[PDB]
Structures are given as C-alpha cells and as structure tokens.
Design a protein around this nucleic acid. Sequence first.
DNA 1: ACACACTCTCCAATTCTCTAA
Lengths: 169, 50, 665, 92, 261
Amino acid sequence: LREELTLESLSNVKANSYSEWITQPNVSRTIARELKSFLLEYTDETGRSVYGARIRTLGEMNSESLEVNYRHLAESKAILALFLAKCPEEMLKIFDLVAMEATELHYPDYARIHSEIHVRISDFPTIYSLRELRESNLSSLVRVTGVVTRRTGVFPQLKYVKTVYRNYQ
Amino acid sequence: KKFFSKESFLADFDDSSDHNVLLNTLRKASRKQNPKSSAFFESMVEDIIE
Amino acid sequence: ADFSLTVLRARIALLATAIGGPDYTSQIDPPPYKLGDDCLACLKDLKRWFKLVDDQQKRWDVAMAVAEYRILTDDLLPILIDWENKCSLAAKLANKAYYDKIALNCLQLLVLMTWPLIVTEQSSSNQITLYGELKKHQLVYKKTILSMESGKVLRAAIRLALDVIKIDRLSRTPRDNMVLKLVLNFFRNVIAIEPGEFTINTKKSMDTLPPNVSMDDISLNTVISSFHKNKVFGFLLTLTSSLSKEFDQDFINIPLLEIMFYFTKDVNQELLFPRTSAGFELSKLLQKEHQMRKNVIKHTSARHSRFGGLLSIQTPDKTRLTVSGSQALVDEKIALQKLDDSKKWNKRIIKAAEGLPNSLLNSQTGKAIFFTESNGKHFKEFINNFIDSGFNILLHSVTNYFTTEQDRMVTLEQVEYLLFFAWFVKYQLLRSKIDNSADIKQVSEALKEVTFILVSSLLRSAYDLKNWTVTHAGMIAFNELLNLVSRTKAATDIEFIVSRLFSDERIQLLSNLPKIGSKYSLQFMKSCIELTHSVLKVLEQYSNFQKVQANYMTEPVIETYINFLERFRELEDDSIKKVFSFFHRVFVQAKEQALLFRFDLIILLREMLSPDGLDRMSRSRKYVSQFSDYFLARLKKRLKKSPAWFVGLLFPPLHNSEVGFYQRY
Amino acid sequence: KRRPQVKLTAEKLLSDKGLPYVLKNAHKRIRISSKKNSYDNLSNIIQFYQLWAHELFPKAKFKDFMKICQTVGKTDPVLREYRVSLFRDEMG
Amino acid sequence: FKSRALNHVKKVDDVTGEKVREAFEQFLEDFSVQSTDTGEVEKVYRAQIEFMKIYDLNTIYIDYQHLSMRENGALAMAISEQYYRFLPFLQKGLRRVVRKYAPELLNTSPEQTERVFQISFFNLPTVHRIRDIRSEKIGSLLSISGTVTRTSEVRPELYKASFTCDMCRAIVDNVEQSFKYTEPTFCPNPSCENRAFWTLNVTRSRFLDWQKVRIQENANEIPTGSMPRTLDVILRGDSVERAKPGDRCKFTGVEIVVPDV
DNA sequence: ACACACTCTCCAATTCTCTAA
Ligand SMILES: [Zn+2]
C-alpha cells in the first residue's frame, strides 16, 4: 500500500507473467510515478522541454490526443519501453491517466473541455508487412503498412456495459 | 562384509572430483541508466511572459 | 477480512525483500545474491507466522502467502547454496558463526514448507479449501530443489549433519541431537511429494500438475540420479550401518525407517533382475496385438452394415424370437449371446481403505516404474549394500522399540513396519534363489522370537477392531515370514517357532481369514489366496493335518475363490495356478465333490475356456481343460444315479439333518 | 401411486410352468459324450438352462437370473420344503 | 462436508506405447552410423539436437531408411501402420533425450513455456497419387504429390485452453480441443455450481499456426477419358506459407477424417 | 402445438444392522 519500489527493483519480474506483474498496486503506482517524472522532465539538447511544449498546444487546438515518440521513451527509463512493447493494453491505461495530470498542470479544469486523453505512440522501431504476422504476435504492439482498400461509414457505439457513446469505423 | 565407517566418509566427501536485438539493447540500457522539471514550468510561464 | 489478509500478505512480501538482494555494481551478469540485515528477525518472524498463527488458527493461508511471493525458490535456496559453496572453497584450501546461524534457519523453513499434507474431518474448512492448490505448489518445490546446480542444496543439508557427526556422542547435547533428526526428516519429504489425488465434495454425481511441471521432473527415477550425484547414498549407508555404536538410537531410527519405506514403495523386485532386448520383446508384443486384432476380425462381417437381413429362431413349444445382423444367420452361440445382451437392467452393486499414501495396499501393482541403466545399477547397489550392511541392526532396534510402545501406535507406523519387513525379506529370497554369492543369513533377524510375536500381535489386534487396512498389511507381512520358514527348513529352533506359530488359536484366525474376503477389493482376496497356499503347504511338510484341512473346506471359502477367479482378465498367469491347485485339493484329494456342483462355476469354465478368453497356448489351458474333463465325468455319474440334482445345481446345498447327509454324498 | 415393480418370486418357481418342467424333461434334454470336447459338452449343458430361464422370466441377464435365485432359494421356507420333498422322494 | 477422493482413479496403460517410446529413445541415442569419410561412429541425431540448440529450432528430421534397418524393422512397421496411436509416445521419447543432452531447448524474465517439438520424416519408400487415397489407409504414414491451386491465409489454432469462472474466483487449465471449440464441464470449486459465462484466458492458453492448401492431380498422370481429382491439405508450425499457387510439390504426413462439426 | 432437452421431486426397492430362539 504505502511503500513504493525503486526503478532498479522493477528490473526483476517477480510474478509468473508480465501482465500479472504490471497489474499489482505497488508496481502500478511505481510505474505511474516514473512516467509522470519522465513527462515533466525530458529535454532537447537545448533544454526546451518538448512535452511541456506539446501539452501547451494541446489546449491551443482544443484537442484530445497527446503524441509521444517511442525513441524518447527508450532513451531513458528503458524498462518502461520494454513493458510497453510487451503489454500495451495495460501500459497505455496507466499512461493515459498520467497524461491527464500533466495537462491539468497547464490548464486546470480542462476536464470540462474533454473528459479523457489518449496517448498516441510514434516511431515504433520494427515493421512487418502482412506476411510476417504469426500467433506469437498476439496482444503485442505492431507497426504495419499498406493501401486502404475499403472504408465503412462512421457510426456511434456504446462505450460502457446512464449511457455514453464513441465514434466507430 | 562391508562397514562404510564414519572416518572414511568425512575424508572422501571433500576430496572427490528483431526483438532478440532489442531485448539485449533495452536490458543493457536499463542496467546502465525541483530544478530538473524547471524547463516544463518555464514553457508554462512563457505564456505569461510573451 | 480480505484487507487484513492482504495486509499480512504485504507484510510477508516486504519481509521477502528486507531479506537482501544481488549486487548491481557487480558487472557480473548476473552475480549471486547479497545479504540484508534484520534478517535474523525476518526469518524468526516468518517462523512465528507459521507456528504462532497458522498452526494456532489451522489455516495454511500463511503457506499460500509465501508461495505467492516464491520465497523458497527465490531466497532460501541461494542463501543456502552460497553458504555451502563458500565453505566448500574454504575447505578446498584446507561473525563466521553468524553465517552458519543463517544456514541452520533457512533449512528449518525448507522442512516446514515441504512437509506432507493430511486432511481429516477435523481439519479446518480453510485447510480443506486450500488442500488442492498447495499440492500444486509443493510439486513445484520438489522439481526446483532437485534441479538447482543439479541439486546442490542437498550437499548443504548433509554438511550440516557432518558438523554433528563430528565429535563424541558423550558430548552431544539435546539441541545438538535435533540437527541429526532434522536432516533426515528433510529427505523424507523430498521423496514423499508426488502427483496429487483428486478430491471433491459429494454434493452431485456429475490432472493437477501445473503448467511448469512434468512427470520426468517428478519421477522416482529422477530422484535416484539426483541423490547419487549429490552424495546422499553414502550418508544413509554409513549412518545406518554404524548405528549400533552409540549414536543415540532413539532419535534416528524411526525417520530412518520412513525413508526405506518411502522409496521401496513402487518397485516390483523382478524389475531389478533381468530373468536389442527391448526391440525383441516389443516385436513379440506386436504379435500379441495381432492376435487380439484377429479376435475382433473373427466377429466382423464381410459385407457392410446396411446389407443385413433378418433372422427368426423358434424354440420348443413353437414360440419365435427375432435377431438382426448377418453373423447371427450362421452362429447360434453368437445369436444366443446377442439376444440376452440387448436387455437393459443390471443389478446395482456393493463395495475398504483410506487415509494414507498410495502403496501396494490399494493399487494394482502389475505396473512398474522405469529406470535408466545407471539408475538401475545404482539403486541395486544402494539396497544391496543396505541389506548386506544394515538390515538386521535396523530391525533389531526398531522392533525392540515397538514391543515397549505398541499401545501408543498410530495406523501409519503399523503400515510402515509391515511393508518394510515384507519388501526386504522377499527381495533377499529372490536374490539368493538366483545366485550363490548371496545368502539368507543377511535377513535372518526377522525370525527371532520377539519380532514373530510382534507381527502376530499387530495382525491379531488389527483383526479384532475390524481395521481392515492394517489387517491387509499384516497379512502381507505374515505371508513372508512363513515363506522364509519353508526356505530355512529346506536346509533346530525353527521347528519350535513353527509349533508356536501353529497353536490352535492361530489356526482359528488363519482359517477364518478367507471367509470375509468375499466382500472386499480385488487385492484383499489375492492376499488371502497366497497366504492360504503357503499356510497349507508348510503343514503338508510338517509330515493334525486332517483336522486342519477339514477346517478350511466349506461354502463361504469356495464363494471367495470363484468370486476372485472370474476377474481373470486382470490377473497373472501364476495366481490361476494357485486357484486350480486348491480345486484339485478340494475335488480329488479330499473327495468333497458336492461343493463345486453350483451353476456359476459352470458358466465360468465356458467363458475362460472358450476361444474368447485364455490364450490357446498359455500354460493355463493345460490345467483348465485337464480339470474340466474330470469335473464333467464325475458330474455325469452323479446326475444319472440321482436325477434330483438337476434342480440341485441352481441353489446352495441344503442343511437339513435327515436328507442332507445323503444329499452331500 | 406409480405402477408396482414386477419381480422373480418363489410362486413362479413352484408354478407348473416353473421348476417341475426341468425335472420332467432334463433327463431327456441334456446329453454328454466322451466323443466331443470338454468345451463342447460344457457348452451344451447351459443351452437348456438358458432357454428355460428366458421362458420363465425374461427381465434380466442370465447371470442375474442365477444370482437372484440364490436369495429366495436360501430364504423362503416353502421353497425349502419343496426341495427336502424332492430328496425325500429319493429317500423313498 | 461429504468430501471424497477418487480412490478408484488408477488408469489403464498401453504397454506397446511405453515400449515404442523407450525403443525410439534408444534409436535417438545410438543409431551410431559411421562417418561419411572414415570408420568412426558419428551419432548424427545427437549432433542434430546440438545443432537445434545452437539455433533455437523446433523441428527434427528423420530418415525412414535409417529407421527401416533398426531392430529388424518392427519399430518402423509400428510407426508406419499406426502413426496416430503412437505419435504422443514418440514425443515423450524425444523430450527425455533433449532434456538429457540439451535442457536449454525445453523452454521457449518471467517463466518460459515449454517448446512444442515436431518430428518429421522423409525418404519414404513410395509416393501415391491423390486418386489412390482410400479409407483402408486412414491414420497410416504416407507421401503424396500434386500441383497447388489455392492457399489460405495463416490463422491461429487453439491447441490448449484455460478458463476462469465468473461467479467465483476459480481457474481451469490444460483443456483439450480436437475438432471443435471445447469448454469445462464443472466449476472446480465446490462452493459454486455455475457452468456458464466462462472466458478463455488468451495469455495462459496456447495456439498454433495453421494453413489450408488445395491440390489437384498432375496432368501427365490422368487416365484415359478421365479428369483430375482434388484434395485439401493442412500445414502447421514452421511449414506455413512454404507452398505457392501453380507450383508442383511433394507432401508427407497422415491422412485423417474430419467430422460435420 | 408439437417433439425434444433438461430439472426436480417422491416413493419404494434394496442391503445393512441388531436381537432372540
Ligand atoms: Zn464458480
């Protein structure tokens, strides 16, 4: 509950699988603190903190998606990049909940503009065509290229199962 | 008939005679790796200044 | 509450890190672990969590917590192995006490977590809930302990013993003697942990190896290899053999009985004696498979399953039946059998043992366990040196204990003693049957008078209180003693021992025993048969005899013999030789023919003798057909002399005084 | 109520359809020969008893017929009276 | 509570399987052919295991001629005529040998799941046509040839399954599938009776690669006045996407029978 | 409404145990 792990303590996965290690409360709190500490602190060579400059423009356009480069996340706190590659569906939930704290630090009451923010990953360093995908890739993050052959119309979809919706295509 | 005595055993006990790339990269980097956050707050305060 | 539960789990987890950790300066990728502080208090409080809380509340929750945080695999083994390897290097060269203190206290937890599991109607609902899961985790423990550095933690446990072997018994304090009990108490558990037994609540009538475990990890074969490399067998051998010389016998010699039980269990002795070979016998077995295939083919139609016509069969009194299929057209035997087979009902049926680990008493032992060649020869060497060195001195001590302590016994110690006796006596008889280098004198402590009384007394007391499992084991032990006696008579005091073994009281008991066997499991009846064969054969070579044999011959014994004989598809070639020996005794010698004129015997001889059952060339058919020929000749004579026996053949014989005498003869 | 169950009973055995038929016919039915195998002659004996058991009480498998017969055969006094009567007839 | 153990559970066992297992074991140990250049024993299958260890492979190739000359041919006959019965025993035999000489191969950081080895055979005595497939040969070992005409995309097939109950915190593991998607029969915790609302744990369960391909007879082999027949073939593991439409191929495996699911 | 799959319930058939002649 109260005590937190060091970053070096996370070097050993102690449970029988990654997902069952990320989802533990002390591990999860440690990851949240470390991600927030990365987002408030990463710099260009010129100082000039890029993510403090991106959150600033998020509100200038009344937007909903924060964009994070993977190379920056791999350049320090490397283990978090490894966990992201292995368990994206958990890691992105924690990362989204950190991004809202960081944006509200610039713009208090931004929750009245949009209730929830999505982190977009960029520059993932390995690529497949639609040949190389196999069962080992299941639930892993992947990067793919091709031509868009067909597109449906846009529809609303029920978000939770009082009601809320989201767009779908 | 055998005997297997103690003193023999004590004496004989001692004397007897591609993600493959990326994983290694990230593990080694992981092993190798308020004023610090001031740049963030400076970017926030520049809206006040400019 | 759930939160109090997880608070204790978290307390344990924090203790699972306060313990220490490896070194990230090291640049040694990876190093070993490195040591914490307060760690004495950490170990001690964990010990308290077991003893002062979980035992007092009867939970097994604490064990579930330590299994969650993987304490055994993660800390205890490297703490011990580092202590061992450090001290080993120091010995190669040829506060330190504090290191040794940590070595002791890590081992005591290893004994506690791997301790074997018992469930009763007095265990808590918590323990009953957790039984199936902690079984999985203990299986993981066995695999891990045998695996690390090819099992090197087992050298730490014996080095601890070696400190207390060291200096004279005259010096050795009670606290000191507990180490020598503790070390052996460890190996008992490591052998005793084995795959789970499935258990459910009988509310409604409707594998447990975890994903990280497999059979070759857990097999007894593995355990042999592991102990041999890590130098255990020398320790058990030296320790048992000099046992008579003033090691205080009291602290060692029951734990040291349990080891010998716990890995004699699940071996048939013939597997240790041979009596391209594998390929040759495989080819022969494929011939047997072809014969079974031929048997199916002989009941298979040539043309397809929808070609089939229809058949009608007319009885006397002109009544008709209908059966389908093309083979029924030609084979009346098949038509008659197929006619009855359609009918729905079967009479529902009745059913003896619980509370103890799998053994000869409640499993079919016609199923070996399997050895590497190196393992086969190493195991043969271990028990051969044990027998030539240790057996008499061990049995003499453990028996003259139990005579002074019989009243206080518990079911397990009884069933251990009776299945350690049995194994070693039989194996030696077989070994000297094979070869002249071996001799029978090595097992000769079994015969002297005190042990004979004790096996007798166990069998007596078990029979009176209707405890059927001890009665079963005692039957097995008492069988071997008699077998050993006939050996020694085929070479003074032994006749005295016989005369005391065959006082009238015991003949009443040993005559009584097959009669009750009719109800019970297939092994129980088999024990009764083999004991009976031996019991009569000794008294045949005593030269009384006519009194004793008439004591055996009556309806409820014959009932057992047939009830056992009809399950012949499952039994050995040898046991049927024993049954027909007895029928030869009843029918020809004693001339008590009237017992066997009963119909369910006549059915049996058709099944077994048909092209269905006993092979056309097994030795069994010689005996069976030679018996049935004589049977039917005497039956013919009886039926024509007095036609009332046609209605006799269905029913039991009739016990009236005035007609019954002429009936039986 | 549900329909009561139908069973083998000593009344069926003591009926004229029952056991007297076997004693009236068995001497004529079965015939052994040394000129045929043990298995041959052994098989032959069971034929008549099987067909008779079916004709008497078709409920159940042949073995179950024999084993059912044991209970009533040992317990019922009237059946035992009939049986001692048979063996008295031979004592006559 | 009326707790009760399955005291009667002790299973029936096939002796032929165990003897085939520990005979195939000895063949893998000591086939002991001499060197291509010299009269020195080489032990090629142990060397092949070492090669697999060096490159983290998952399949082993065996020559049917080497098996034919072993132990008067009885082992080869048993494998040939009853492959479907004996394939699990062959797997069990190989697992022990790889444990003995290369335990690094048994696993595929947290814990690592076991490697699903594949045995493969080649150089069989004769090749059949698609027109020679007949129901008497079901489950035997064969080799076939033809021209490829279609191929399917690679799909994941469920090999072993694991489920967890909705009404209580309980888990079921290592459920076996065969031809249709299959789920547990009871809640293992006796404090709960719900049979519904299972969910398949995608992390703990295990899958395989699977591909369907379709072939037709070689044009030069068609008999007089007749037309070419076709067949559907299954590919799994490290052999998917090896085949190409319009090419000519040779296959080996066992013919099977598939139900109306 | 018409064959099916599945659940629930009650009643008597059966075997086991104790007592006395
Ligand atoms: Zn449930």
